[PDB]
Design a protein around this nucleic acid. Structure first.
Ligand SMILES: [Mg+2]
Ligand SMILES: [Zn+2]
Ligand SMILES: [Zn+2]
Lengths: 99, 1239, 395
DNA sequence: AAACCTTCCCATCAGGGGAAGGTC
DNA sequence: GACCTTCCCCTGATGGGAAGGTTTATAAT
């Protein structure tokens, strides 16, 4: 099975594991460590930013690819903003600074 | 942004986020399904259900966006805002936050230094508590029950306030003056001794001052307003078919709202206490279950015995958010399939199915088709690729050309689990994999599956070619040996070629060159094993790096001459004149790489494979039932041992021998008989083939198929053969570990039911051990990567001569690993001199590549002080020099290369090859090799016999051979029999060591886990604290007493020991610090404290290397050294120096103390503190990184009260927010970006 | 034990039960308090409560003037509290007590002159009440005091009354436990009905309070279930209908052998048949997104849910390409036609405009515009100008 | 569960008008 | 040419109805 661009999960924007051939392959912590062992910053970033999260980055990268331009404008992974909302849902206040 | 901060949430700051108040626990209508007013899904509080559309429908378009329709109070905007809009519920009565109460270090608990139990009692409305007593009979804080409070109000109606419940705890936190209380504890720590006065005081003061530093207020521990989560974070989305799907968060919030509303109603309704107190407790229960369910009662969802998942459960754990989402995600542009062999591939390419290529590269194909006028618009290209038009196939060829793809094996033990290849379009649905890489992936073609990833950006396409390329990674990082090596058929074909047999057709003839050898074999005239001698032209570059070819005739075979054609130009042809099995196809490859380089070696390996496969194919190399020849002697040997056991049987039945004596007897005789049988078949195999030389018999090494497979190393070893053609030893139970009735049969004869059943016993423990070990090895390697990540090569040089002394591991008689292997690739700490003192063999510091290793090996040298990572003058990282060299590339390590992760991987990948249990089995000394006795650190004396006797416990026995190297190391106890002395000349084994017998872990993988965790052994040995004669104590009171007796100055130190523990130290003898008064297993803390950092960093490596040496695993000490460095990163000050028992990071103590010591001020003395891997990882500057790995709740709570801040300064926290990690390419980018920042 | 349900079950044991004299005499204490209130009214509970609140309003009106004059004459003038109470007690009607306090001639006596102006009018407010309520400013206070005493008697007696019979609430609530509502919720919703029963019980009817409290608590628990059980709240009568349908289908099990035909319930029930299927389609309850999935694995129902609001990028790229194509195409026509098309449609503009809307600022009104559009669309209808755009329409 | 009653919201019906059609 | 009856659109007028609330007395802990 193979997949280029399929559907995504509702609460957290990540390609679904189904159903079932069109699920995106899993990139666990071990594969992230493998990408860290080699010095491969852009591969890892595009792996966890453009290809799974970053609701805007997916569309940006797709349009660029179809235009012959291979460049990524990485944004914030949606799961991280969800995490910020969940932490803030407690008596905890977690924010971000200047820019 | 550039940082993240966490702090307490004040009620007003809570309302700030909220855009509306939730009043009713409703979600949708049940017939319209629209969001009810003030419900959890209210479109007025949060936002519209539909994009750019109003709930009432009056406002419908992008024409007007910013407006709040007076109809329904909805503002028409993007519906995605329901993902970001929060809300709030106004709690009728205050409610405490569970984390600030139930967490191990209870915030409110030691914030007022009240006990947790009493706060819990007060919250349940089971007692009162006083607040702000002033001039009262009672204190400002106290507890009293119903009757006590009953008649207490009449005493003082005013000036005496005692509440009950959460309001009481809040008010106690509010009127509390933190500065006033703090300003006392300080003095309570100064005057009064008795650490009980210092147990919680020294931590309570920290808590107070950090609370003041953060700026947050204590009253916020009790939640006045309850924040709510946006609706899209807990959707009620319709699950089709039909039924709805909600989040347990919704049920929890519904309960909370119901209870708060009932409390309000009762308040207005004027109900008595018991009712409202029960309601308050219900509300507290609902809130605590909504925040962190399970700590109190585990509320359950309806229609299930399953508890409803709360907020905190959506963050912590392997499942949940941190591990399962932020650190790892499912990824687009990827695929999966079954891998199979295509050998025709080059090392840099792999066969990729066309069906997968079409789907993966879909956007590239669309764009390329639209570029060349082949498609009007993007939709047309979509439809074309959907129609399977021929024109697109060429386009595919155009877009895949020179576009690397990442191949990944399911389990990723080390970085080689992912490698990039050049796609080669193929039909079918199977992925073609290169054989040489199978060793790196640890993947067989038995059905294993692999995944593929397509790099998107140009930068990723470059990283898949210069860094992760299959050809750019050949030799492993854990050890210099190449991981790309011919495995089974290659080495078999080469061994068949290089083999020689006397009397082969054309033997002894001569040929013009290798071409004629090939032409002679392929024509059927000459064989491939003839002993022919031919002319070959070998190339040797010499005396200025100038190639000079050499022509001559050599003693060789036809097959070796044919194999010489593949060898690159620079090799000497002495590499090709031998049996040519696997073990030195490996060394041939290694020498080719370290002589000619990467480019020749790649094609060399490709050619080795290409030739070995075809030659093993045309050789036949089959296996028949007759190939396994049993020894005819086996019958007699078996019968002899079988009879031998009958004497033992008669021995025990009488009582002449005990049961255990007879069992050991039988087992020993059977093991010896097994030795005999295996030896018989081996002698009948190795020299089996005998033929006529020039017409007369002669015996040579055999051509037997299975034996050739054993000898070449392509497949099963000798232990397999012993069971193939002889009695297959004797089996072992799970424990008991050996049975008396061995397996007489060999696999060829066939087993009978009983012996097979006996074998299954040992078979099960083997199978089972692999499965459950898979789970624990992951845990080990994960902890290892967790303790190491942020450590990166950051500096060029540290400038320290410290290093560590590298000496060969000469244990017992011979050496386990020479010094070249423990020194190669590293840098000298100081100038090694020739054995003649005062000279220079190597400069101050230089990278010792193979040439310096050879130079050292020639000169008599077993002493080289090597710079190590543990001892290095670098802060927040390691410098390239002290670390040394290592990579797939053999040069000095680059800068910015994250070595901690690769070291954790180098230690974790072999962790799966270990075992869970060891179950070992097995007196003057006899020197083996001719040399000279050299004693080390021994005090002796002469006695009646006239010879020498040892007076010291520690005495090493070295051997200075005719060369001058030390290959012998033996320890002799007190009162030995010395025949020669120190600096004598021994014969070929003269015995100079004699004494008396008496005078009178698991281990494996769990062992490795124990060593890296610094776990105290069961029965520890204790260590002397200072030099001096030891002194005894009063008597046996409980255990015993032991008085330290320093010789000269301060001599008050002491300790207490149990008399049940035997003693070993001498009574009236001097004993230096770090000596064994008691035999036993040592602990890392004790070694570190009583010996030093280098002693303990050597102990850890030497001990953890034994378990890996037992199993065939070889890893350079460098990774273990980096781990050890990461362990002892903490330390504790002693004298408080210029500025403030404390524990801090070593680097910070230096940055604060050494810079001021320069400034002429007072120095600060620290004490190295040793921590396990998990404990050292528990302490980290970044709170995000710590909260990701373990204990999310506790870490987040503590960082919240601390108001701590995180600039992410690291790897894990960067991948969490999806940024360039600060290493490798990320290091190059972060360097430029950070240079311009903060400056 | 730890759970709060235990902190409640064992807390109510301290309050002893009451029967049978206790019921009657505590009810007599309640009625005696309310009868104290009844005489105080002289000088259906729905109007009675307004009468009570009106007395309370009168006392608040008087106390307002009291505290105003007090702040004026003590805080703003520094007269001792005793010199205020002694002179103010007894009249509370006229200004005779102010001039005397002026004549006192103490230091504060001068500041009275200034607050005399501000107190005179406050006193007229206070005195007028006498001509309204036909009472003196003192009798109002006394009546309110006695009636507050009556309220206190009723309060103590009623709290004791509910505390005594608390156990019956649990006795009733244990029957309903498993209806998607927690246990303490049930017992509390029953206590509410117990209070409502206490306030509406005549001890003289001779019946035992158990029956009335039982009825009220049963209602307060069942209706509360209907209200707070389902995540999607349902009208109260619909829960009754659902329960009736389920009861009938349960009773007919042994009759039909296995289960009843759906058309029968419309017969057995009063309702026509077409609504029964809607009532059964409505009853579906939400499934937790944490529900384990096939293979009993970690995967849950909250995972297999895609997001369908999103538009796949394959279509957004086509949207941008159509944008560019129509941008290049509209430039091929004239400027008049270009503006007309970008006006009638929202192309490159804030919003679309209607016929007269476009004609307003184009100097020639409706029909002219109608002739341009139909012409331009005709000029673009022609191939060799519509191919690149025709590639976008596929059906 | 039934029993009679009140507030609010429908989506449709009696009523009005402004003219409209047809004719001794 | 008017008169008598006819053919269609806004104010609201409302019977209709769904959603909501208050009672129910044997005794019943
Ligand atoms: Mg396999
Ligand atoms: Zn609106
Ligand atoms: Zn260094």
């Amino acid at each position: 099975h193979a997949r280029s661009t399929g559907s995504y999960s509702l609460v957290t924007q990540q390609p679904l594991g189904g159903k079932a051939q069109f699920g995106g392959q899993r990139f666990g912590e071990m594969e992230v460590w493998a990408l860290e062992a080699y010095g491969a910053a852009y591969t890892l970033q595009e792996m966890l930013t453009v290809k799974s999260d970053d609701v805007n980055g997916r569309t940006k990268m797709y349009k660029n690819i179809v235009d012959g331009n291979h460049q990524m404008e990485p944004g914030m992974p949606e799961s991280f903003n969800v995490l910020l909302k969940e932490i803030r849902s407690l008596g905890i206040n977690i924010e971000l600074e200047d820019e | 942004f550039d940082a993240i901060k966490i702090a307490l949430a004040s009620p007003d700051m809570i309302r700030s986020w909220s855009f509306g108040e939730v009043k009713k626990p409703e979600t949708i209508n049940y017939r319209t399904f629209k969001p009810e007013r003030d419900g959890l899904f209210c479109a007025r509080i949060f936002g519209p259900v539909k994009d750019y559309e109003c709930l009432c429908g009056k406002y419908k378009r992008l024409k007007h966006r910013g407006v709040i329709c007076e109809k329904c109070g909805v503002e028409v905007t993007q519906t995605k805002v329901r993902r970001e809009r929060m809300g709030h519920i106004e709690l009728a009565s205050p409610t405490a936050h569970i984390w600030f109460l139930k967490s191990l270090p209870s915030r409110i608990g030691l914030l007022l230094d009240m006990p947790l139990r009493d706060i819990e009692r007060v919250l349940y409305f089971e007692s009162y508590v006083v607040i702000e007593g002033g001039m009262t009979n009672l204190e400002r804080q106290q507890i009293l029950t119903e009757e006590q409070y009953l008649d207490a109000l009449e005493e003082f109606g005013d000036e005496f306030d005692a509440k009950m419940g959460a309001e009481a705890i809040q008010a106690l936190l509010k009127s509390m003056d933190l500065e006033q209380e703090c300003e006392q504890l300080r003095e309570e720590l100064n005057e009064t001794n008795s650490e009980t006065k210092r147990k919680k005081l020294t931590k309570r003061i920290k808590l107070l001052e950090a609370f003041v530093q953060s700026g947050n207020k204590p009253e916020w521990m009790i939640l006045t307003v309850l924040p709510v989560l946006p609706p899209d974070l807990r959707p009620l989305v319709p699950l089709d078919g039909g039924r709805f799907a909600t989040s347990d968060l919704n049920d929890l919030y519904r309960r909370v709202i119901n209870r708060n509303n009932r409390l309000k109603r009762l308040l207005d309704l004027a109900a008595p206490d018991i009712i409202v107190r029960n309601e308050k407790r219900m509300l507290q229960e609902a809130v605590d279950a909504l925040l962190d369910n399970g700590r109190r009662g585990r509320a359950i969802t309806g229609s299930n015995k399953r508890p409803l998942k709360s907020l905190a459960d959506m963050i912590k754990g392997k499942q949940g958010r941190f591990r399962q989402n932020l650190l790892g995600k499912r990824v687009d542009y990827s695929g999966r399939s079954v891998i199979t062999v295509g050998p025709y591939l080059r090392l840099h390419q792999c066969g990729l199915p066309k069906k997968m290529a079409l789907e993966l590269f879909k956007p590239f194909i669309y764009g390329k088709l639209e570029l060349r006028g082949l498609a009007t618009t993007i939709k047309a290209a979509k439809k074309m690729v959907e129609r399977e038009e021929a024109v697109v196939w060429d386009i595919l060829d155009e877009v895949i050309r020179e576009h690397p793809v990442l191949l990944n094996r399911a389990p990723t033990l080390h970085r080689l689990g992912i490698q990039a290849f050049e796609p080669v379009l193929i039909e079918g649905k199977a992925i073609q994999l290169h054989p040489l890489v199978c060793a790196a992936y640890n993947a067989d073609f038995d059905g294993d599956q692999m995944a593929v990833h397509v790099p998107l950006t140009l930068e990723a396409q470059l990283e898949a070619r210069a860094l992760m390329m299959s050809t750019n990674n050949i030799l492993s990082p854990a050890n210099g040996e190449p991981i790309i090596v011919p495995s089974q058929d290659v080495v078999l074909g080469l061994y068949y070629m290089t083999r020689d047999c006397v009397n082969a057709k054309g033997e002894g003839m001569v040929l013009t060159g290798p071409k004629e050898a090939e032409r002679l074999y392929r024509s059927g005239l000459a064989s491939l094993h003839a002993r022919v001698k031919v002319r070959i032209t070998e190339y040797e570059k010499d005396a200025n790096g100038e190639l000079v070819a050499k022509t001559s005739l050599k003693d060789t075979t036809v097959g070796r001459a044919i194999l010489w054609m593949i060898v690159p130009k620079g090799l000497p042809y002495s590499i090709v004149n031998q049996a040519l099995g696997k073990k030195a196809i490996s060394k041939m490859l290694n020498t080719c790489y370290r002589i000619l380089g990467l480019k020749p070696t790649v094609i060399f390996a490709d050619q080795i494979m290409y030739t070995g496969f075809a030659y093993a194919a045309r050789s036949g190399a089959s296996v028949g039932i007759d190939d396994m020849v049993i020894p005819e002697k086996k019958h007699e040997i078996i019968s002899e041992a079988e009879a031998e056991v009958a004497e033992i049987q008669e021995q025990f039945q009488s009582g002449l021998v005990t049961a255990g004596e007879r069992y050991n007897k039988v087992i020993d005789i059977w093991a010896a008989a097994n030795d005999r049988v295996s030896k018989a078949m081996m002698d009948n195999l190795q020299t089996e083939t005998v033929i006529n030389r020039d017409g007369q018999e002669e015996k040579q090494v055999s051509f037997n198929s299975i034996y050739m497979m054993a000898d070449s190393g392509a497949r099963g070893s000798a232990a397999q053969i012993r069971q193939l053609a002889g009695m297959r030893g004797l089996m072992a139970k799970p424990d008991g570990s050996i049975i008396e009735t061995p397996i007489t049969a060999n696999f060829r004869e066939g087993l009978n039911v009983l012996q097979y059943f006996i074998s299954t016993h040992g078979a099960r423990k083997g199978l089972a051990d692999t499965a459950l070990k898979t789970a624990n090895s992951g845990y080990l390697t994960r902890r290892l990567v967790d303790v190491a990540q942020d450590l990166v090569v950051t500096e060029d040089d540290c400038g320290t001569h410290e290093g560590i002394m590298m000496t060969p591991v000469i244990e017992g008689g011979d050496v386990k690993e020479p010094l070249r292997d423990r020194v190669l690739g590293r840098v000298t700490a100081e100038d090694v001199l020739k054995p003649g003192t005062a000279d220079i063999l190597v400069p101050r510091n230089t990278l010792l590549h193979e040439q310096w290793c050879d130079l050292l090996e020639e000169n008599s040298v077993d002493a080289v002080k090597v710079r190590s990572v543990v001892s290095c003058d670098t802060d927040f990282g390691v410098c390239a020099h002290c670390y040394g060299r290592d990579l797939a590339r053999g040069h000095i390590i680059n800068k910015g290369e994250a070595i901690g992760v690769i070291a954790a991987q180098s230690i974790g990948e072999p962790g799966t090859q270990l075992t869970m249990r060891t179950f070992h089995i097995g007196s003057s000394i006899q020197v083996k090799n001719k040399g000279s006795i050299k004693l080390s650190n021994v005090k002796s004396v002469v006695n009646s016999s006239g010879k020498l006797v040892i007076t010291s416990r520690n005495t090493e026995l070295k051997l200075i051979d005719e060369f001058g190297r030390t290959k012998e190391s033996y320890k002799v106890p007190y009162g030995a029999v010395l025949a020669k002395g120190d600096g004598e000349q021994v014969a070929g084994g003269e015995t100079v060591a004699n004494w008396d017998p008496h005078t009178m872990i698991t281990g494996g993988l769990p062992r490795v886990a124990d060593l890296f965790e610094a776990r105290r052994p069961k029965e520890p040995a204790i260590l002397a604290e200072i030099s001096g004669i030891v002194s005894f104590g009063k008597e046996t009171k409980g255990k015993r007493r032991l008085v330290i007796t320093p010789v000269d100055g301060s001599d008050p130190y002491e300790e207490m020991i149990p008399k049940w523990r035997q003693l070993n130290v001498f009574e009236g003898e001097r004993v230096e610090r770090g000596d064994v008064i008691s035999d036993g297993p040592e602990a890392p803390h004790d070694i570190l404290r009583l010996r030093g950092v280098h002693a303990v960093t050597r102990y850890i490596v030497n001990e953890v290397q034994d378990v890996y040496r037992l199993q065939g695993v070889k890893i350079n000490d460098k990774h273990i050294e980096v781990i050890v460095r990461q362990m002892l990163r903490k330390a504790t000050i002693v004298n408080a120096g210029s500025s403030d028992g404390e524990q801090v990071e070593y680097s910070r103590v230096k940055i604060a103390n050494r810079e001021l010591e320069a400034n002429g001020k007072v120095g600060a003395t620290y004490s190295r503190d040793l921590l396990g891997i998990t404990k050292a990882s528990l302490a980290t500057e970044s709170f995000i990184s710590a909260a990701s790995f373990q204990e999310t709740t506790r870490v987040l709570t503590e960082a919240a009260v601390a108001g701590k801040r995180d600039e992410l300064r690291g790897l894990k926290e960067n991948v969490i927010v999806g940024r360039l990690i600060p290493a490798g390419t990320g290091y190059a980018y972060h360097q430029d970006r950070m240079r311009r920042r903060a400056a | 034990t730890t759970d709060p349900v235990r902190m409640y079950m064992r807390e109510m044991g301290t309050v002893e039960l009451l029967t049978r004299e206790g019921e009657i005499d505590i009810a007599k204490r309640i009625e005696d308090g309310i009868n104290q209130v009844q005489c105080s009214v002289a000088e259906v509970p729905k109007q009675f409560d307004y009468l009570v609140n009106s007395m309370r309003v009168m006392m608040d009106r008087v106390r307002t003037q009291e505290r105003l004059i007090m702040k004026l004459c003590v805080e703003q003038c520094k007269m001792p509290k005793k010199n205020f109470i002694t002179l103010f007690t007894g009249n509370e009607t006229s200004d005779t007590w102010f001039n005397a306090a002026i004549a006192m001639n103490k230091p504060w006596s001068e500041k009275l002159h200034d607050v005399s102006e501000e107190v005179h009018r406050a006193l007229q407010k206070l005195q007028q009440i006498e001509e309204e309520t036909g009472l003196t400013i003192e009798q109002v206070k006394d009546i309110n005091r006695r009636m507050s005493i009556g309220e206190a008697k009723a309060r103590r007696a009623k709290k004791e009354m509910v505390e005594a019979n608390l156990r019956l609430v649990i006795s009733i609530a244990k029957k309903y436990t498993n209806r998607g509502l927690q246990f303490l919720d049930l017992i509390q919703e029953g206590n509410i009905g117990l209070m409502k029963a206490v306030d509406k019980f005549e001890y003289r009817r001779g019946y035992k309070f158990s029956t009335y409290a039982t009825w009220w608590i049963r209602q307060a628990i069942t209706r509360s279930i209907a209200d707070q059980a389902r995540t999607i709240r349902i009208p109260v009568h619909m829960i009754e209908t659902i329960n009736k349908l389920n009861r009938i289908s349960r009773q007919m099990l042994q009759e039909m052998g296995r289960e009843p035909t759906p058309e029968e319930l419309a017969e057995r029930m009063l309702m026509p048949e077409d609504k029964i299927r809607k009532v059964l389609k409505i009853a579906k309850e939400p499934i937790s997104m944490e529900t384990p999935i096939g293979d009993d694995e970690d995967s849950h129902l909250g995972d297999f849910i895609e997001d369908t609001t999103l538009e796949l990028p394959l279509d957004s790229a086509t949207t941008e390409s159509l944008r560019a194509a129509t941008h290049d195409v509209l430039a091929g026509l004239t400027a008049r036609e270009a503006k007309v098309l970008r006006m009638r449609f929202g192309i490159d503009m804030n919003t679309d405009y209607t016929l007269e809307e476009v004609g307003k600022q184009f100097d020639v009104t409706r029909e002219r515009i109608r002739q341009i559009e139909a012409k331009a669309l005709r000029k673009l209808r022609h191939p060799s100008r519509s191919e690149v755009l025709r590639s976008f329409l596929d059906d």
